[PDB]
Automatic annotation (TrEMBL), chains A, B:
Identification of the protein by name: Centrosomal protein, putative
Full-protein residues shown: 327 to 361 of 380
Subcellular location: Cytoplasm, Cytoskeleton, Microtubule organizing center, Centrosome, Centriole
Entry coiled-coil feature ranges: 12-35
Species classification: Eukaryota, Sar, Alveolata, Ciliophora, Intramacronucleata
Family: Belongs to the CEP135/TSGA10 family.
Signal peptide: none
Amino acid sequence: LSQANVKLLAENSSYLEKLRKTEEILEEYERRFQI
Amino acid sequence: LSQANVKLLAENSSYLEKLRKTEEILEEYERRFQI
């Protein structure tokens, strides 16, 4: 918790941000088919 | 409260799994969507 958590938290944030972006993109993508 | 560093690891894995759902979710549709 002096090193591993530091990188892990940094990566956690990165992973969360990636997920956030993808979900937002996906929400926009609701209009990819319909018919 | 190791459910700091290992909770964090477990969460990171959980989020990587989530990213990997979502990235396929974002890629699909494109095959017929792009038309």
